[PDB]
Structure of Proto-oncogene tyrosine-protein kinase Src:
Amino acid sequence: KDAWEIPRESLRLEVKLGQGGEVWMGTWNGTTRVAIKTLKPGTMSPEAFLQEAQVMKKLRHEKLVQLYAVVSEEPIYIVTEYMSKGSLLDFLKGEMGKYLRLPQLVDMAAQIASGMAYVERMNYVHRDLRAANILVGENLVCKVADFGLARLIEFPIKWTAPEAALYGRFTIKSDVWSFGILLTELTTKGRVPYPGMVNREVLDQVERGYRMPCPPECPESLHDLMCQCWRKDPEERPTFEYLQAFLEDYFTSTEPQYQPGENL
Ligand SMILES: CCN1Cc2c(ccc(F)c2C#N)O[C@@H](C)CNC(=O)c2c(N)nn3ccc1nc23
């Protein structure tokens, strides 16, 4: 057992924030607001449930959801930090959605690209990168999460690169693709990529060279970044280090003459 092993009674689960096990907002050692991901026995394999905690032990970054502790004895628990604003998907679709603008939305994208550039230096792949897996706290802080499929190197189709959805080639540039889809989520405020298309139709058109057009009120200089994320050859895609640098200097180097619109 590791040093992440805490007593099974040191947690006081309270409010459930969504379930599938479930997700609870509770207490740790008396005073720590935490988020407790739990394994509700569906007789699910705990080695397949602690695999999400195995990767979360080696990844520490200010833009990643910080694991707090693990309970590896049935029933299984996973304790992480509590994000006060919930998932980014619900945030873009919630009441704050209509008020978000391009300066704030690009900032959230630079935080995601910062945390996605961290694990790019650690030689890991996330494999389920999407706004439904990004979590928001106060001050518009976005930490990527849901490492239940992340693993060290050696489907939700609409977010996956073709070579990963087709040939299982989940690499550092297969998530760069999902980042470009994440940029369409942020620019449309939570809308589903490829409107009106089913998973099979997306797989057919993406393999035929089809790419999503420019979101309304989105600058072509940002949709160009999405196309670079959606390049067929995985090595043509930009690094997350370039992605984080691009989005941090966006309104000085790329769009210095940005004027706000009704939506962006
Ligand atoms: C225990 C880990 N998870 C589960 C989780 C989600 C939603 C998206 C995610 F990428 C993750 C992850 N990884 O759970 C959703 C069902 C609901 N969870 C929350 O609204 C939440 C929150 N407000 N802070 N916070 C912190 C952690 C946390 N979930 C939350």
About this structure: Residues 17-18, 23, 35, 37, 65, 80, 82-83, 86-87, 133, 135, 145-146 surround Elzovantinib (CB under 6 Å). The two ends are 50 Å apart (CA to CA).
